Write an enzyme that holds these catalytic residues in place. Structure first.
Site, PDB file in Angstrom:
ATOM      1  N   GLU A  62       0.818  -1.206   0.000  1.00 52.22           N
ATOM      2  CA  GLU A  62       0.000   0.000   0.000  1.00 52.22           C
ATOM      3  C   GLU A  62       0.854   1.259   0.000  1.00 52.22           C
ATOM      4  OE1 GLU A  62      -2.551   0.045   3.348  1.00 52.22           O
ATOM      5  OE2 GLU A  62      -0.979   0.456   4.819  1.00 52.22           O
ATOM      6  N   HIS A  63       2.120   1.165   0.413  1.00 45.73           N
ATOM      7  CA  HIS A  63       3.020   2.297   0.220  1.00 45.73           C
ATOM      8  C   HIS A  63       3.467   2.417  -1.233  1.00 45.73           C
ATOM      9  CE1 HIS A  63       3.003   2.812   4.488  1.00 45.73           C
ATOM     10  NE2 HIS A  63       3.979   3.701   4.463  1.00 45.73           N
TER      11      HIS A  63
END
Lengths: 420, 98, 445, 57, 78
Positions: free
Chosen positions: C59-60
C-alpha cells in the site's frame, strides 16, 4: 418534496429552509451570527463559554433533562463555531425530531444561565482550550488573526487565560440578548417538514427584536509575531488581505489557493500538481509541508502561505514558497493548471455538499450570508467562470499587499517580514 | 396566628442568638448543595452569624434584646435554592423510576 | 414516512460476479460524486511472519508508479481529475479507494485496476519507502493508543498470525525485497477475493461494463496449486505491562474474546457497548450523562477518556474497553468498568436497553450517511458476510434484541472469562491479573 | 526613586521610583471603606417582602 | 555615566536583574512571594512528524472551526 429545497423568509428577519429528502435521520440546525466577531475587549471568551454552555439549565428544561432526553433518544447535539457565526445542530430519528427541536430551541432561545453552572464550567473551558491548543496550527491561526486585524477578528476563538474566571452570567445574558436575535438567525432542517419548521419558528423565535449590534468592520493592521517554544518543527503563516465572501475576487482567490495547493489528494503522496510543494521540494531533502491558506469572511479576507518545516531549513522553505507565489503573480502559469485547480475546487465543493453535515452547514452559511439558497450547479458555473487573469490579479494583490506573519517554534533561522 | 407564630418564634430560641430559620435548618446533602449555590455576600453573612452563634453558646450568653432578630425581618435567603435543589433531586428520582 | 419506510426507501445494493469471480457491487445515490474502491481479503492474518510487512509495503508502493503510468504519472492524472485517493489495511482487509466525480468513472476504474493489477515496484522506490516506513513506525511508536492496541492483539493472539501488527517488525521491514512483494501480489491479490465497490452517482451497468473491460484478466489461479487457507486463532487470556513512568498518562485496554463477523450476537454486544458508552474530557454532558461509567468518571474525576471497542475478524474478536487516565485512578476505573460489565451481565433494564438500541440505530444510520462510508460498508460486507446486510435487516435485529437476551449474551461473553490486558505508561496502580479476574466474577451472583 | 522608609527595620531602605515618590496608586476613584463592626446603632434594610416569602406551596 | 544604572533613572532595576547567591546581612524590601500559581492540565502527547508523508496535510488551509458536542469529542478543523 425532494425535488427542490424549500426556502422562505419570515417577516421578523428569520430564514427558514427545509428539504424533505425522506432520510432516516433528520437534522435541525439554527445558525446564529453570534461568533467571536461580536465581542469587544470587555467580554472576551463569552462566545467560547456560551459554546460550552450549550447544555445548561434552561427556562423550560433542566440541564439533566436536556442531556438525559437527548441521549435517551440517541440523537446528538453539537455546536460548530466559526469567528463569523455559531451553529446549533441536533440530529436524530424523524419520530423524535419534535422533542429534539423542543430541546434545541429551549437551549438556544431561553437559557437560564445560573452562576454556579458557569462557575463549574470555567474549568471545562480551560481544559477545552488546552485540548484545542494541543496542536500548533490552532495557536498559529489564532495569532495570525490577532496580528492581521485590529478589532472583531483579532478576537480569539478561545477564551484568554485572564478572562477565564472572569466571564459572568450577566455577560452571557447580555451577549445572548444582543446577538441571538431573529434577523441574525436562520433555522434550516434536513428531513423535516416546512410546516413544522414554520410552526416551531413562530412558536419560539418570534420574540426577538431585530438586527442587534452592528459590528466593527474588522480593520486590517498587518505585522508579525514570533513565538519561540522549542518544537521540533517550525510553523509560519504569511498572509495578506483578500476579498470577502460573495466576490469574483474571492472565487479567484479560492482557485489560486487550490492551484498553489490546498492540501493532499493522495495518502503519502508527493503533490505533483501542488506548485508550492514542488517548488519547496526542489531545494530540500527534509520533512516539510507547504500549503495555501485562504479564509474569507463577511467583509474581509486573508490569503497566504502556511509552511511547516525544520528549524534550519525554515528560511529557504519560506523563501521558496514566497518566490513561487511571486512567480505566479508575475504570470508563470498555464491554462491546464488553472483548469486542474478549477476541477479540484469543484470536486472539493461537491464532496463538502456530499455528506449531510456539509450540506446542512452549507445551506446554513448561505442562509446567513446571502439570505437565499444558491444551487451547486450555479456555484460550479461561476467557479468555471473564474479566469486565469483573475488568478494573476489575486496573486499580485497578495504579493503587493501588507503582510501578517505568525511564526512559532525554534525561530533562529526563520526570516522576518522585512527580510522577505 | 401572626401573634402565635411570633410567640413560637421567640420561644424557639434561635432568634435570641441572632440566627435565622434558614441559618439554623440542618445540613442534609440538598442543603449543602444549596449553600454551595448561595452567593458570596449571603454565604459570608451566614457563616458569620453561625460563628457568632457558636461564640454565644460557648459563652452561655445571648444577644441583647434590641440585637435579637425579629419575625418581621427574617429573610428566607436559602429557601428558593433549596426548592430548586429539591426539584432537581425529585426529577432525578423520577428519571430513575422510569 | 417514519423510520421503517425511510429505511425501506434507502436504495438497495447491486452485486454481480465476473467470469474470474471478482465481485462487483454498487449502490446508486442522487449525489454528483462517487466513491470507487477495491477491497482485498488480505492482511497480517494471512501473512506468515516472513512477509509480515508485505501488505504495508504494497500500500506504500501502490501509488508510486505502475507499468503503464510510471513514476508520478498516476498521481498527476488523479490530481488533474481532482479525485481524492486513499488506502488502508487492517489485519484482515486491504482497501484502495478513490473519491471522484460521477463523470470520471472510466478514468477512476482504469486507475484502480492499474493500481491493483499492474503495480511496478522499482528497487529505488522500495528502498525509499523502506526508510519512510521505518520513520513512520517510529512515529507510531511515539503515538500511544496504537501501541496499546498492538500490545492487546499480541497478548490476546500470541502464537497465531493475528498477533502480528500490520506494519510488522523493523528487521523484516529492512529485509523484505521485491521478490517477496511480487510473491505477495501473486498469492493474495486473487480475483475472487476482491470486491470492486462503488457508491453514489454510479450506474451499475456502466460499472459492470467497466469491470468487464479492465478487471477481466486477473488470473485467479495459483502458480503451483499453492492455495492458502484460513485457520482459527487461539485467544489467550493474558496480560502485558509496559511500564515507562516518564509518560504523562497511562493507557489500559481490557478485552475478551469476541463472537466474530458472522455471529448474530454482534448486534447485542454492540448494544451492550452502547450501554457502557464512552467519555472524553471535552464532553459537554458532565455528571448528568446517561452512561453510569461516564457519570461516575466525571463525579470522581478519575479518567481522561474511555471508549468501548468490538473488533471482529473471521470467527474471532476483541471486545472490551480502552481507557486513558492518570496513575492514581487506574484501579478505580478498572473496578468501575468491571462493575458495569457485570451489572449488564446480572441486572439489565428495559429502559437502558431501549436507550442503547436507539443509540446503535442512530450510530448506524449516521455512519452510513456518506458515500465513502457506504462504499466502505459495501466492501467490508461483501468481504465478510458475503452479502450486504440492509438497514432494514439491521433494524429488525435491533428490534429483536431485548433485555433478556442482552443479559444472556453478556453473561456468555463477559462473565467468568479470562481477559487480555494491555497496559502502557505509569501502570503501577494497574491491578494484578488475579484481581482483574476477581473483578470479572461477582460473589453475589 | 532611591530611598523609601521601611516599617520593620525603621530605616530608609532602597526602593524604586513607583513606590518611593508615588506611594499613592494610580487608581481612578477612591473606593469606600468597610462596614462599621460592633456599631451601637443598627439600621437593617427590608429585603423584598415578608408576605412574598415564607410560602411553602 | 557609562552604565545603565546611571543612564536610566527609574528603569535601572527593571533593566537589571539582581539575585544573590547568599543572603546579605541587611534584608531587602519588597521580598515578594509566588502565590501558589496553578498547573496546566495533563494531556496525552501528540505524535511528531518524522517524514514528509506524515507531515503532509498538517498545514492549515481553511478558517479555524471549533466543534463541541453533548456526547461528541471537540474537534478543531483547519
Amino acid at each position: 418534496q425532494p425535488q427542490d429545497l424549500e426556502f422562505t423568509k419570515l417577516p421578523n428577519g428569520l430564514v427558514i429552509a427545509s428539504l424533505e429528502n425522506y432520510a432516516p435521520l433528520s437534522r435541525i440546525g439554527l445558525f446564529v451570527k453570534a461568533g467571536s466577531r461580536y465581542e469587544d475587549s470587555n467580554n472576551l471568551g463569552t462566545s467560547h463559554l456560551l459554546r460550552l454552555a450549550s447544555s445548561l439549565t434552561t427556562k423550560g428544561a433542566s440541564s439533566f433533562k436536556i442531556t438525559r432526553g437527548i441521549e435517551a433518544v440517541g440523537g446528538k447535539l453539537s455546536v460548530t463555531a466559526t469567528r463569523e457565526n455559531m451553529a446549533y445542530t441536533v440530529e436524530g430519528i424523524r419520530s423524535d425530531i419534535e422533542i429534539l427541536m423542543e430541546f434545541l430551541l429551549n437551549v438556544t432561545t431561553a437559557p437560564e444561565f445560573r452562576r454556579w453552572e458557569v462557575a463549574a464550567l470555567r474549568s471545562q473551558l480551560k481544559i477545552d482550550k488546552a485540548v484545542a491548543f494541543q496542536n500548533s496550527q490552532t495557536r498559529i491561526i489564532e495569532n495570525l488573526h490577532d496580528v492581521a486585524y485590529k478589532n472583531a477578528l483579532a478576537n480569539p476563538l478561545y477564551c484568554p487565560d485572564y478572562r477565564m474566571g472572569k466571564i459572568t452570567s450577566e455577560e452571557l445574558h447580555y451577549f445572548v440578548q444582543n446577538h441571538f436575535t431573529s434577523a441574525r438567525m436562520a433555522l434550516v432542517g434536513l428531513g423535516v417538514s416546512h410546516s413544522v419548521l414554520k410552526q416551531v419558528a413562530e412558536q419560539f423565535l418570534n420574540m426577538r427584536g431585530g438586527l442587534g449590534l452592528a459590528g466593527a468592520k474588522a480593520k486590517y493592521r498587518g505585522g508579525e509575531i514570533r513565538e519561540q517554544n522549542g518544537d521540533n518543527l517550525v510553523h509560519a503563516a504569511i498572509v495578506a488581505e483578500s476579498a470577502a465572501i460573495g466576490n469574483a475576487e474571492a472565487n479567484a482567490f479560492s482557485v489560486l489557493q487550490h492551484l498553489l495547493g490546498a492540501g493532499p489528494h493522495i495518502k503519502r503522496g508527493n503533490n505533483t500538481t501542488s506548485l508550492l510543494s514542488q517548488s519547496v521540494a526542489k531545494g530540500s531533502h527534509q520533512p516539510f509541508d507547504v500549503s495555501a491558506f485562504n479564509a474569507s469572511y463577511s467583509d474581509s479576507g486573508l490569503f497566504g502561505i502556511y509552511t511547516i518545516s525544520q528549524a534550519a531549513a525554515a528560511g529557504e522553505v519560506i523563501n521558496a514558497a514566497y518566490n513561487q507565489v511571486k512567480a505566479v503573480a508575475q504570470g508563470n502559469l498555464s491554462s491546464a493548471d488553472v483548469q486542474a485547480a478549477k476541477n479540484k475546487l469543484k470536486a472539493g465543493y461537491l464532496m463538502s455538499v456530499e455528506t449531510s453535515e456539509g450540506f446542512l452547514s452549507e445551506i446554513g452559511s448561505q442562509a446567513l450570508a446571502a439570505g437565499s439558497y444558491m444551487p451547486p450547479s450555479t456555484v460550479l458555473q461561476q467557479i468555471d467562470s473564474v479566469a486565469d487573469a483573475d488568478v494573476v490579479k489575486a496573486a499580485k494583490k497578495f504579493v503587493s499587499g501588507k503582510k501578517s506573519m505568525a511564526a512559532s517554534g525554534n525561530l533562529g533561522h526563520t526570516p522576518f517580514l522585512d527580510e522577505l | 396566628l401572626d401573634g402565635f407564630r411570633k410567640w413560637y418564634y421567640n420561644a424557639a430560641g434561635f432568634n435570641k442568638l441572632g440566627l435565622m430559620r434558614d441559618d439554623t435548618l440542618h445540613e442534609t446533602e440538598d442543603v449543602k448543595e444549596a449553600i454551595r449555590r448561595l452567593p458570596e455576600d449571603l454565604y459570608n453573612d451566614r457563616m458569620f452569624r453561625i460563628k457568632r452563634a457558636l461564640d454565644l453558646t460557648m459563652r452561655h450568653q445571648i444577644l441583647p434584646k434590641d440585637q435579637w432578630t425579629k419575625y418581621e425581618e427574617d429573610k428566607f435567603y436559602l429557601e428558593p435554592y433549596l426548592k430548586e435543589v429539591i426539584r432537581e433531586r425529585k426529577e432525578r428520582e423520577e428519571w430513575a423510576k422510569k | 414516512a417514519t423510520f421503517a419506510q425511510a429505511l425501506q426507501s434507502v436504495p438497495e445494493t447491486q452485486v454481480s460476479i465476473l467470469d474470474n469471480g471478482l465481485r462487483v457491487a454498487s449502490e446508486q445515490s442522487s449525489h454528483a460524486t462517487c466513491t470507487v474502491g477495491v477491497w482485498i481479503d488480505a492482511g497480517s492474518r494471512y501473512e506468515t511472519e516472513k512477509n509480515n510487512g508485505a501488505g504495508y509495503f504494497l500500500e506504500h508502493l501502490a501509488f508510486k508508479g505502475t507499468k503503464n503510468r510510471p513514476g508520478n504519472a498516476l498521481e498527476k492524472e488523479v490530481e488533474s481529475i481532482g479525485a481524492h485517493l486513499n488506502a488502508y489495511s487492517t489485519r484482515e482487509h486491504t482497501a484502495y479507494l478513490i473519491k471522484a466525480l460521477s463523470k470520471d468513472l472510466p478514468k477512476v476504474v482504469e486507475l484502480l485496476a492499474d493500481i491493483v493489477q499492474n503495480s511496478s515496484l522499482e528497487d529505488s522506490q522500495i528502498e525509499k519507502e523502506r526508510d519512510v516506513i521505518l520513520r513512520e513506525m517510529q512515529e507510531n511508536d511515539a503515538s500511544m493508543q496504537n501501541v496499546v492496541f498492538d500490545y492487546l492483539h499480541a497478548t490476546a493472539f500470541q502464537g497465531t498470525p493475528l498477533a502480528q501488527a500490520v506494519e510488522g517488525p523493523s528487521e523484516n521491514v529492512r529485509r523484505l525485497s521485491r521478490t517477496d512483494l511480487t510473491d505477495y501480489l501473486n498469492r493474495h491479490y486473487k480475483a475472487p477475493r476482491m470486491v470492486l465497490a462503488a457508491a453514489g452517482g454510479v450506474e451499475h451497468q456502466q460499472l459492470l461494463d467497466l469491470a468487464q473491460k479492465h478487471l477481466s484478466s486477473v488470473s485467479r489461479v495459483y502458480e503451483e496449486d499453492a492455495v492458502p487457507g484460513l485457520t482459527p486463532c487461539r485467544f489467550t487470556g493474558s496480560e502485558i505491562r509496559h511500564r515507562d513512568d516518564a509518560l504523562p498518562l497511562a493507557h489500559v485496554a481490557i478485552a475478551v474474546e469476541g463472537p466474530g463477523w458472522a455471529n448474530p450476537d454482534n448486534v447485542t454486544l454492540q448494544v451492550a457497548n452502547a450501554i457502557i458508552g464512552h467519555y472524553d474530557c471535552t464532553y459537554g454532558g458532565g455528571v448528568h450523562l446517561s452512561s453510569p461509567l461516564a457519570s461516575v468518571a466525571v463525579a470522581n474525576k478519575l479518567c481522561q477518556s474511555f471508549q468501548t471497542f468490538n473488533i471482529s475478524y473471521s470467527d474471532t474478536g476483541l471486545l472490551g474497553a480502552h481507557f486513558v487516565c492518570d496513575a492514581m485512578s487506574i484501579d478505580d476505573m478498572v473496578f468501575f468498568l468491571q462493575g458495569q460489565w457485570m451489572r449488564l451481565c446480572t441486572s439489565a433494564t428495559e429502559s437502558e436497553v431501549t436507550r442503547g438500541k436507539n443509540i446503535l440505530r442512530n450510530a448506524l444510520v449516521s455512519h452510513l450517511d456518506g458515500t465513502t462510508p457506504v462504499c466502505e460498508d459495501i466492501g467490508r460486507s461483501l468481504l465478510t458476510y458475503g452479502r450486504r446486510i440492509p438497514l432494514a435487516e439491521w433494524e429488525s435485529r435491533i428490534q429483536e434484541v431485548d433485555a433478556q437476551m442482552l443479559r444472556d449474551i453478556c453473561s456468555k461473553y463477559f462473565y467468568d472469562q479470562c481477559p487480555a490486558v494491555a497496559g502502557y505508561g505509569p501502570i503501577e496502580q494497574l491491578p494484578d491479573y488475579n484481581r482483574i479476574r476477581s473483578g470479572m466474577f461477582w460473589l453475589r451472583f | 526613586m532611591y530611598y523609601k522608609f521601611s516599617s520593620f527595620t525603621q530605616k530608609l531602605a532602597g526602593a524604586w521610583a513607583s513606590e518611593a515618590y508615588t506611594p499613592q496608586g494610580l487608581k481612578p476613584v477612591s473606593x469606600x471603606x468597610x462596614x462599621x463592626x460592633x456599631x451601637x446603632x443598627x439600621x437593617x434594610x427590608x429585603x423584598x417582602x415578608x408576605x412574598x416569602x415564607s410560602g411553602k406551596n | 555615566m557609562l552604565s545603565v544604572a546611571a543612564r536610566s533613572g527609574p528603569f535601572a532595576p527593571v533593566l537589571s536583574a539582581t539575585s544573590r547567591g547568599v543572603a546579605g546581612a541587611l534584608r531587602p524590601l519588597l521580598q515578594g512571594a509566588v502565590p501558589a500559581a496553578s498547573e496546566p492540565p495533563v494531556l496525552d502527547v501528540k505524535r511528531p512528524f518524522l517524514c514528509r508523508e506524515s507531515l503532509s496535510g498538517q498545514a492549515a488551509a481553511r478558517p479555524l472551526v471549533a466543534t463541541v458536542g453533548l456526547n461528541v469529542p471537540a474537534s478543531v478543523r483547519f
